[PDB]
Design a protein around this motif. Structure first.
Motif, PDB file in Angstrom:
ATOM      1  N   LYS B  10       0.817  -1.364   0.176  1.00  0.00           N
ATOM      2  CA  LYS B  10      -0.693   0.021  -0.061  1.00  0.00           C
ATOM      3  C   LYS B  10       0.809   1.930   0.000  1.00  0.00           C
ATOM      4  O   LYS B  10       0.629   2.561   0.059  1.00  0.00           O
ATOM      5  N   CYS B  15       6.482   7.142   3.664  1.00  0.00           N
ATOM      6  CA  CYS B  15       6.573   8.158   4.623  1.00  0.00           C
ATOM      7  C   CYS B  15       6.684   7.849   6.408  1.00  0.00           C
ATOM      8  O   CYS B  15       6.297   8.532   7.253  1.00  0.00           O
ATOM      9  N   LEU B  41      -5.782   2.090  17.585  1.00  0.00           N
ATOM     10  CA  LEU B  41      -5.196   1.907  15.775  1.00  0.00           C
ATOM     11  C   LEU B  41      -6.255   0.944  14.949  1.00  0.00           C
ATOM     12  O   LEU B  41      -6.353   2.105  13.628  1.00  0.00           O
ATOM     13  N   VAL B  53      -1.289  11.567  17.410  1.00  0.00           N
ATOM     14  CA  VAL B  53       0.626  11.392  17.348  1.00  0.00           C
ATOM     15  C   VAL B  53       1.122  12.567  16.094  1.00  0.00           C
ATOM     16  O   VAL B  53       1.432  13.215  17.667  1.00  0.00           O
ATOM     17  N   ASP B  54       0.361  13.429  15.583  1.00  0.00           N
ATOM     18  CA  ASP B  54       0.647  14.360  14.803  1.00  0.00           C
ATOM     19  C   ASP B  54      -0.828  15.071  14.604  1.00  0.00           C
ATOM     20  O   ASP B  54      -0.470  15.290  13.079  1.00  0.00           O
TER      21      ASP B  54
HETATM   22  C1  HEC Z   1       2.153  10.813   1.937  1.00  0.00           C
HETATM   23  C2  HEC Z   1       2.929  10.250   3.412  1.00  0.00           C
HETATM   24  C3  HEC Z   1       2.071   8.953   3.875  1.00  0.00           C
HETATM   25  C4  HEC Z   1       1.716   7.800   3.171  1.00  0.00           C
HETATM   26  C5  HEC Z   1       1.983   7.707   1.819  1.00  0.00           C
HETATM   27  C6  HEC Z   1       1.406   6.892   4.890  1.00  0.00           C
HETATM   28  N1  HEC Z   1       1.284   8.206   5.870  1.00  0.00           N
HETATM   29 FE1  HEC Z   1       0.482   7.386   7.786  1.00  0.00          FE
HETATM   30  N2  HEC Z   1       1.247   9.176   8.216  1.00  0.00           N
HETATM   31  C7  HEC Z   1       1.441  10.424   7.695  1.00  0.00           C
HETATM   32  C8  HEC Z   1       1.273  11.963   8.569  1.00  0.00           C
HETATM   33  C9  HEC Z   1       2.388  13.454   7.753  1.00  0.00           C
HETATM   34  C10 HEC Z   1       0.871  11.086   9.627  1.00  0.00           C
HETATM   35  C11 HEC Z   1       0.814  12.698  10.964  1.00  0.00           C
HETATM   36  C12 HEC Z   1      -0.035  12.907  10.695  1.00  0.00           C
HETATM   37  C13 HEC Z   1      -1.054  11.423  11.703  1.00  0.00           C
HETATM   38  O1  HEC Z   1      -0.301  11.355  13.024  1.00  0.00           O
HETATM   39  O2  HEC Z   1      -2.561  11.305  11.750  1.00  0.00           O
HETATM   40  C14 HEC Z   1       0.735   9.860   9.518  1.00  0.00           C
HETATM   41  C15 HEC Z   1       0.028   9.033  10.463  1.00  0.00           C
HETATM   42  C16 HEC Z   1      -0.198   8.204  10.695  1.00  0.00           C
HETATM   43  C17 HEC Z   1      -0.303   7.168  12.147  1.00  0.00           C
HETATM   44  C18 HEC Z   1      -0.492   8.084  13.184  1.00  0.00           C
HETATM   45  C19 HEC Z   1      -2.233   8.324  13.281  1.00  0.00           C
HETATM   46  C20 HEC Z   1      -2.596   8.859  14.615  1.00  0.00           C
HETATM   47  O3  HEC Z   1      -2.836   8.192  15.935  1.00  0.00           O
HETATM   48  O4  HEC Z   1      -1.822  10.288  14.705  1.00  0.00           O
HETATM   49  C21 HEC Z   1      -0.883   5.682  11.238  1.00  0.00           C
HETATM   50  C22 HEC Z   1      -0.874   4.973  11.819  1.00  0.00           C
HETATM   51  C23 HEC Z   1      -0.537   5.633   9.899  1.00  0.00           C
HETATM   52  N3  HEC Z   1       0.261   7.330   9.646  1.00  0.00           N
HETATM   53  C24 HEC Z   1      -0.358   4.500   9.157  1.00  0.00           C
HETATM   54  C25 HEC Z   1      -0.219   4.984   7.593  1.00  0.00           C
HETATM   55  C26 HEC Z   1      -0.585   3.449   6.400  1.00  0.00           C
HETATM   56  C27 HEC Z   1      -1.125   2.254   7.970  1.00  0.00           C
HETATM   57  C28 HEC Z   1      -0.099   4.345   5.386  1.00  0.00           C
HETATM   58  C29 HEC Z   1       0.397   3.065   4.166  1.00  0.00           C
HETATM   59  C30 HEC Z   1      -1.550   3.003   3.884  1.00  0.00           C
HETATM   60  C31 HEC Z   1       0.466   5.162   5.879  1.00  0.00           C
HETATM   61  N4  HEC Z   1       0.145   6.161   7.018  1.00  0.00           N
HETATM   62  C32 HEC Z   1      -0.058   5.986   4.372  1.00  0.00           C
HETATM   63  C33 HEC Z   1       1.736  10.558   6.356  1.00  0.00           C
HETATM   64  C34 HEC Z   1       1.512   9.252   5.157  1.00  0.00           C
END
Ligand code: HEC
Ligand code: HEC
Lengths: 86, 86
Positions: B10, B15, B41, B53-54
């Motif tokens: 995926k 990132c 989660l 988290v962010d």
């Molecule tokens: C384009 C970059 C990008 C991609 C690709 C990406 N993420 Fe993220 N993800 C982020 C960013 C920016 C944050 C911080 C914002 C947030 O915490 O939600 C984050 C946060 C998260 C978090 C923490 C959520 C929280 O509680 O704050 C999880 C779990 C996560 N990503 C899972 C995934 C998974 C699984 C995938 C693949 C399906 C994925 N991410 C793909 C950018 C990305």
């Protein structure tokens, strides 16, 4: 259709800044590569054409295309024309 | 189910590196935040729970969740347990 809004809302900008290569190539670089190749850019966005900008990381970008599977061809064209405008 | 394979395929790793914050938080940081919170989660991965988290960049991550809409709950759990293992 509003290519800018589609780009924003599908999260593309996270890896594609206008004028700087980051995780993905800049929009400027992509726009240059696809100059006069709008049809091919649309094909690329559909999963239909090969990477021509950064083939080394083709497999990283590919899954992002799955987002676009709810778009019409006109919407894909608008997204392409937003990219090309850079 | 194979959470590692789902994560790979995926495109998540682009990132999310294991031990370094980049575009998104490290897997280690996410795993720590969600320690003992597997259910939450999984909810997050479904679009069902807030960023913890962010939050500043919640809207960047959100669209990535659309990828996961073909996964069963067991597969989402496997993906969660891969993240949590870090
Ligand atoms: C384009 C970059 C990008 C991609 C690709 C990406 N993420 Fe993220 N993800 C982020 C960013 C920016 C944050 C911080 C914002 C947030 O915490 O939600 C984050 C946060 C998260 C978090 C923490 C959520 C929280 O509680 O704050 C999880 C779990 C996560 N990503 C899972 C995934 C998974 C699984 C995938 C693949 C399906 C994925 N991410 C793909 C950018 C990305
Ligand atoms: C997780 C970071 C990431 C996200 C998010 C992302 N891309 Fe990319 N993209 C890449 C990478 C890495 C490349 C270089 C590989 C390649 O050229 O295919 C790339 C390349 C491209 C290219 C050039 C393809 C070529 O011919 O080489 C286009 C067009 C593109 N992306 C469009 C988009 C659009 C539109 C979105 C939003 C739906 C998007 N990208 C989201 C990482 C990303």
């Amino acid at each position: 259709a509003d290519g800018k809004a589609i780009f924003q809302q599908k999260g593309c900008g996270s890896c594609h800044q206008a004028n700087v290569d980051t995780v993905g190539p800049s929009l400027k670089k992509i726009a240059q590569a696809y100059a006069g190749k709008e049809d091919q850019l649309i094909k690329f966005l559909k999963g239909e054409a090969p990477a021509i900008v950064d083939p080394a990381k083709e497999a990283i970008m590919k899954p992002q295309l799955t987002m676009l599977k709810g778009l019409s061809d006109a919407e894909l064209k608008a997204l392409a024309d937003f990219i090309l405008s850079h």
